[PDB]
Design a protein around this ligand. Structure first.
Ligand SMILES: O=P(O)(O)O[C@H]1[C@@H](OP(=O)(O)O)[C@@H](OP(=O)(O)O)[C@@H](OP(=O)(O)O)[C@@H](OP(=O)(O)O)[C@@H]1OP(=O)(O)O
Ligand SMILES: O=P(O)(O)O[C@H]1[C@H](OP(=O)(O)O)[C@@H](OP(=O)(O)O)[C@H](OP(=O)(O)O)[C@@H](OP(=O)(O)O)[C@H]1OP(=O)(O)O
Ligand SMILES: Nc1ncnc2c1ncn2[C@@H]1O[C@H](COP(=O)(O)OP(=O)(O)O)[C@@H](O)[C@H]1O
Ligand SMILES: Nc1ncnc2c1ncn2[C@@H]1O[C@H](COP(=O)(O)OP(=O)(O)O)[C@@H](O)[C@H]1O
Lengths: 885, 885
């Protein structure tokens, strides 16, 4: 939508005028003029949006060229800004910088012609404003939306295929067999196969169970490395071994672990199965493979008997729609006939019905909306076999979205097919692109999380992984939605364009690449950069690859010089050895991610990019030294890192009264303990997440820095992590008293502190802490005895400890819901008093002593009797690692 | 040929037995038995080769099974070598090395199994050549092959096509019309183009003329870079800007010098034309493009009138056949009729005439041989349209090559089709690959050049360029010939395999790779190594990519670990930042050629190797410290580079009587001036080609360590090159006395020495000097007065010198043949006395004063008058790069 670009340009111009007067100084009148005209433009596009522009040709004619004239302005202003900052570097103290001030004033001549153009067009727009304001529709207020807790996890009317499949498997002893499943896209082969892979009988039967996704763009060796990973810890060794030997190693590991069930998803080409099957050892055991698909030929080839999936009958259809649109509550009677007619209109496709329930949630729950939706569906599914019917249905759902979500959905279609989207990165990309604008009081990140939850609710985006906290950790887009969104973006809106290279084709020429605004290259990238492209109007550049590619020493300069107007640059999948000066000459850079293996210092010139919001760095060295004045970069909001970062020593200005305290700074992913000082925390009042890697001892000792005591100043801090990199128990470490920590702290992580279990009382004293995660021998001992305090703790996580005896009472953990016990191969039993807590719902116990498993089964039987006893308890689910136990 | 493999194994086994008793100490008995078995079986293989091999299957089966055991013996022997060297590396002083000595005894058991297999072949038949001994064919002696002679520079029957093409240009000025040349394969379009391009009218008609070769796998950017690099000297910019901008610059430069005539060779598809045609924007000038295409559709798309290359007429065909087979001499009357039958059977395809001429010259000059050849040609040229006729003719020609020369002719397809092959690289490769073996007294490289001349004489190898010396410089195979050799090698013999992946195809599995003995890649080797392939039976690797490519630091150790028995490592188009230690266990390496841009030190572990013969490095480091002990490598024949290599100080051991005098060394291209001490020359009695690069004044001055005086000691030196990197003239340099130079010096090159023409007398005194090359103001001054001495000189190269006045008489250069003057914008006139030099053959003049051009025209007129007077003076040739001069 043109509104997005208009708003972003207005905001950036305002920020540049307020903040940096000197750069814009030669053209201030033109800046203010463009500001007024863009405000008026935005109002006009809103008024046009109120109407159905597609209904009138004149309205559609009017919108065109609103966007091009706006685009011409953005270009001229940005070129001017970069030119004048280069002038500042020139340091021409001449009063009249006649040489090359006439170049920045050539850009200003373009600016002036552009201001003249914008003054025009605005006069024509004033014509037809009154006529447009005569008409309006959908005059209503805005309501709230609510978080997407799990709902309808049960699968309507699909027990039949589940039981048939679970029956078929385990037929012939000592045979490696494959179970094909087919059925048109959106039917639910993955959903049913998930229900199988999570049915109790399957987990009872086979010990090893691997979930594997194999699309068309799948890679064989990438898959083998990960499957070997399922068994062992490190794959960096097998980065240097052949696929065949890798196939052999997977075979040995998989054969060792008794039986095995392996799931490969959405296969496309029979040769794909032919190649992948090698790793599986046919060692004369009843091991079952479960592949699903869409094409019939491959299913038939891999086994002469494919099990075809089934459509949902009319009743299943209506019940499913009722569930999705009305969630737990039951439908009010008046809409029943409408909903049943729509369900019948669907023909029993779970995908069409699901998206339609999303559209109904979007419209409302009033009879007029239901009748209109019924009429529209009765029109857009006249055929069955044509997939574009699903596209028409999704378009109908899509039309009702707010334009802000319209931008986010398309931009979520940017990622490659089959790629699992990291939610935090997706939110930060949305922020840096300008799709989320200040409205209200929520922090930008919270608004982004709410937007993602909204998109999940109407069933456009399917969630894949969730956190311990219950939040979302990784999402993606179903194939049909990906195709519809990609076509809509690359064709209509020109949001972005992709450059995947088919056989016997060439990367476009400079004239074509001239008309792009964003690039995505998810295929051979070094090949596009060996050509030395040049497109002055590329603002973003995305490359979400699978492997890590090295960048040749003679090829580093190409990105900075080819695209001198970047804003977003995510090349996390490309490893750099260094950087060139043109890099530090990129002055519009907002988002910047990159990897590296020999980087140790963040050069100081990097602090001259005065618009950076986000920074993400990967480095193999333990210590990363930062020399750029991050206290100078006003708008910095995040600084991620995987090594231990050594922040610079802060100094306030001497001749300037102004103090350097960043109000908008929310993260310091991993800083060294040496910098956990009073001043570092004086400068970050609003900090919400902090991490410290290094030798946690320096913190805990009270000589060098009362560092844990320094932590008291961060009032809003809500997440902390203590990572120790020393591998030597030089002394014993002691946590300070529980009045030093912040009050809202909600999630803590320890790793190799090696603390004594008596200190757990201090943590019990904390009030709001909701998740405790101690990994890799965080607390050392053999005797912990609960002493109360964990009033609100919701998830407990213990991994790689030598604890033996634990003792508690049902009043120690009143709100427990989740309990994680990993790699505790020296614990004996879990206290049974944990079976008394009502909310205790999920437990898991990995690589643990079998006596603990027997006690856990006792606890499960206890809670089963409780729920049987008429209490309104939440259902009980257990998990014990041993297949036998 | 299998005899080649048997002989290679025999020679290596004898070498290993002689040099190191320890390496074969455990299995010396079976090794010697295998050696004698190989000798007798090679006698058997020769006896088989005496009888027809192509026509008999049982005979091939007899000799077959011996090649397999020979390959297996090679594998096991190299395995034992690497294993014994690994034992040495372990440095176990135990009398009984309980770990790994049983593994080596099992490898000895494998060696004994191969010995048993060879003895089993001998048991099946004591010799197996009794039937072969009964029948003998082709008994005759081996006589001389003539030294190469440039001959038949005239083209027969294509002059009328040349006239028609030269009538095409001047068709319509102020326009761009493409000339299409269309013909069947081996027809001679490219010869007609190479003629017309060389026509005096063409050079006079256009000041600028370009020759461009459009292969099937052409890349546009590299072609444009070549066109640009033609005109200018500096290209640091054009490596940085894009191919659209590159074509724009090509337009600019071709328009700077007015009208131009460019040639595109062997256009295959239409897209080639559509994309290359944008680089010739007509500047409303009379511009012509010459396009040779085998296909016709592309020609019609280029221009609705393609120039149709006719077939040779019968008389033209015969004059060709007699010229080729007989060279200057005419056809003897008795062979006239057999020749006429052969030529009339050729159907006019000149390539058939040429290949049959090669077959005749190889066979001999007797009527029975001519009749046999004619009958075969009749038998195999029944049809007309099928190109496979040429494959059949080539097969006839090939069955007659000497088995050594057969192996030589083949494996030339290992170099990708269409690639100019440096002759020196081919010769050194043949030497390293055991292809050329010690037979007689000729030096290995001399025998290699002899073989290459022999092949070229047979007209199976084409020469692209020569030298003022007239020595072959670069050679390439014809398209059809390259295709034939490719199919031959990859199918019937298994000399090498070409891993060229389509879009669908994937790289081979390790299983397929197991049966390969030589690898040739010509597509992405980066991706090939990305799959991390492995192979033990691989001895040769070649990848002639067009560009230079980097090896990611994680991909560096792939080649060693995958290939532990590597001999020929042809990776010169690959870049190496560093080397894994696994490189330094490749005890089977014979040939190492590789690039780099940061390598400053060759590690001492490089010296550990012993089997290498050639070392080749092109680094951009101005210095290259060589810390390997080269003096301990006896078989080092060649250490080629372009850097100012600083050799290690030759130190004799304190407790050894062995003289570290390497009797195999032949060349030290660009050693450091500091490294020219009496010792290093004293270690190399047989040095043949030397050149220095660095601070040469350190060589000249007597106070300085007298390097140039010591250079006398090399009695076998024949090639000397002196190069100065010092751009600063801190003093004037003076040459030593004439006697100090080696007696047998024959070619000299001077760059950046800025000598004083008064010294030219000293160089005159040199008795044997035959090539002189002064460049980069080699001699600094304004007036030259030649004083004689250059009795045996033949060619004179003057480039970028500020000479003003030259005075010479005909008595100074009685035997000289070639004058050339590059960029002498200072030179006034050329001594007209040089016109009296009978031997004077060809003159060239580039970017000189027009006065020199007019005086050169005077000299040309004088020579034309001389020959017009009845003197048997050789034809003279004049050429001026700018015709305006
Ligand atoms: O062995 P050299 O005495 O050093 O001469 C050779 C050779 O010159 P000749 O034709 O006289 O044998 C090549 O031929 P030209 O170029 O001189 O015609 C030349 O090839 P390039 O200049 O193309 O490289 C080559 O150069 P290189 O050392 O790179 O192999 C090098 O002569 P120069 O090095 O002095 O140019
Ligand atoms: O499951 P989560 O709720 O995501 O909690 C953590 C945490 O994530 P958050 O701090 O954002 O909540 C870490 O995030 P990052 O370190 O990447 O910033 C991540 O990595 P760590 O191990 O270093 O804590 C870790 O993932 P994992 O432990 O698997 O590596 C993950 O916990 P999960 O195990 O559930 O992913
Ligand atoms: N039996 C069912 N009941 C309700 N919804 C379903 C059912 N089966 C699939 N779905 C819906 O379909 C989507 C899952 O996609 P799916 O059909 O499994 O992809 P594919 O079948 O193409 O692999 C989800 O939105 C899910 O809610
Ligand atoms: N005299 C000639 N007449 C016709 N074609 C020729 C002649 N000489 C070379 N050719 C062409 O050159 C190619 C092979 O040339 P070749 O026999 O090597 O001679 P040259 O060394 O002069 O090129 C073929 O395409 C052939 O048609």
């Amino acid at each position: 939508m043109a509104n997005v670009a208009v708003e972003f340009l207005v905001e950036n111009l305002m920020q540049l005028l307020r903040d940096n007067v000197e750069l814009i100084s030669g053209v201030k009148e033109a800046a203010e003029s463009l500001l007024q005209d863009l405000n008026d433009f935005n109002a006009f596009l809103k008024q046009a949006a109120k109407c159905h522009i597609n209904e009138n040709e004149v309205l559609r004619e009017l919108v065109k060229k609103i966007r091009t004239v706006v685009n011409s302005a953005e270009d001229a202003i940005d070129k001017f800004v970069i030119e004048a900052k280069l002038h500042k570097d020139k340091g021409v103290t001449r009063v009249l910088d006649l040489p090359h001030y006439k170049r920045v004033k050539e850009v200003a001549g373009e600016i002036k012609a552009i201001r003249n153009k914008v003054r025009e067009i605005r006069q024509t727009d004033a014509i037809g404003l009154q006529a447009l304001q005569d008409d309006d529709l959908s005059a209503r207020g805005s309501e709230e939306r609510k978080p997407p807790v799990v709902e309808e996890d049960d699968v309507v009317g699909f027990d039949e295929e589940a039981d048939i499949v679970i029956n078929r498997l385990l037929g012939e002893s000592n045979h490696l067999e494959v179970v094909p499943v087919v059925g048109m896209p959106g039917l639910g082969k993955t959903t049913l196969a998930n229900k199988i892979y999570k049915h109790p009988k399957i987990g009872y039967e086979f010990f090893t169970r691997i979930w594997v996704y194999v699309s068309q763009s799948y890679r064989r060796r990438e898959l083998f490395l990960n499957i070997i990973s399922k068994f062992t810890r490190n794959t960096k060794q097998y980065h240097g071994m052949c696929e065949e030997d890798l196939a052999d190693e997977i075979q040995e590991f998989l054969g060792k672990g008794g039986k095995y069930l392996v799931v490969l998803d959405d296969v496309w080409s029979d040769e794909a199965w032919e190649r992948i099957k090698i790793a599986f050892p046919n060692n004369n055991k009843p091991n079952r493979v479960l592949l699903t698909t869409r094409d019939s030929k491959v299913a038939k080839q891999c086994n002469p008997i494919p099990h075809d999936l089934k459509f949902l009958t009319e009743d299943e259809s209506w019940i499913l729609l009722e569930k999705k649109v009305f969630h737990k509550d039951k439908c009010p009677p008046e809409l029943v006939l409408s909903g049943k007619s729509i369900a019948k209109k669907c023909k029993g496709l779970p995908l069409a019905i699901v998206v339609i329930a999303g559209a109904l949630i979007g419209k409302g729950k009033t009879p007029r909306e239901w009748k209109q939706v019924d009429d529209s569906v009765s029109e857009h599914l006249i055929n069955r076999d044509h997939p574009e019917n699903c596209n028409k249905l999704v378009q109908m759902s899509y039309d009702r979205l707010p334009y802000d979500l319209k931008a986010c959905f398309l931009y979520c279609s940017a990622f490659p097919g089959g790629f699992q989207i990291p939610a935090w990165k997706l939110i930060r990309l949305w922020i840096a692109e300008g799709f989320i604008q200040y409205k209200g009081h929520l922090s930008l990140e919270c608004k982004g999380e709410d937007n993602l939850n909204d998109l999940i609710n109407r069933n456009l985006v399917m969630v894949m992984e969730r956190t311990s906290d219950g939040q979302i950790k990784t999402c993606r887009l179903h194939d049909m939605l990906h195709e519809f969104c990609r076509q809509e973006a690359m064709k209509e809106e020109n949001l972005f364009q992709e450059i995947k290279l088919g056989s016997e084709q060439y990367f476009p020429g400079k004239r074509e690449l001239s008309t792009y605004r964003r690039l995505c290259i998810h295929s051979s990238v070094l090949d596009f950069f060996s050509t030395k492209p040049s497109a002055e109007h590329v603002r973003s550049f995305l490359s979400f690859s699978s492997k890590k590619i090295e960048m040749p020493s003679a090829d580093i300069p190409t990105i900075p010089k080819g695209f001198p107007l970047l804003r977003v640059l995510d090349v996390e999948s490309i490893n750099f050895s260094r950087f060139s000066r043109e890099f530090y000459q990129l002055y519009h850079l907002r988002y910047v991610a990159f990897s590296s293996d020999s980087i140790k210092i963040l050069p100081k010139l990097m602090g001259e990019l005065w618009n950076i919001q986000t920074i993400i760095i990967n480095t193999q060295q333990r210590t990363l030294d930062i020399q750029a004045n991050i206290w100078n970069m006003e708008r910095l909001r995040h600084l991620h890192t995987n090594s231990s970062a050594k922040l610079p020593v802060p100094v306030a200005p001497k001749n300037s009264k102004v103090t350097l305290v960043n109000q908008s700074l929310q993260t310091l992913s991993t800083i060294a303990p040496e910098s956990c000082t009073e001043e570092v925390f004086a400068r970050t009042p609003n900090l919400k997440k902090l991490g410290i890697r290094g030798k946690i001892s320096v913190l805990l000792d009270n000589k060098s820095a009362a560092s844990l005591k320094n932590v008291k100043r961060l009032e809003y801090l809500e997440n902390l992590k203590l990572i120790n990199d020393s591998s030597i128990q030089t002394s014993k470490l002691r946590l300070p008293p529980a009045y030093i920590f912040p009050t809202k702290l909600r999630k803590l992580t320890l790793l190799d502190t090696w603390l004594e279990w008596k200190d757990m009382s201090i943590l019990g004293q904390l009030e709001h802490l909701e998740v405790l995660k101690m990994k890799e021998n965080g607390f050392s001992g053999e005797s912990w005895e609960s002493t109360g305090g964990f009033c609100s703790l919701l998830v407990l996580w213990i991994e790689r400890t030598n604890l033996v005896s634990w003792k508690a009472s049902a009043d120690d953990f009143p709100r427990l819901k989740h309990l994680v016990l990993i790699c505790c191969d020296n614990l004996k039993e879990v206290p049974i008093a944990l079976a008394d807590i009502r909310s205790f719902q999920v437990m898991m116990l990995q690589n643990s002593t079998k006596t603990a498993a027997i006690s856990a089964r006792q606890i499960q039987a206890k809670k089963d009797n409780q729920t049987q006893q008429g209490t309104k308890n939440i259902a009980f689910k257990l998990s014990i690692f041993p297949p036998d136990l």
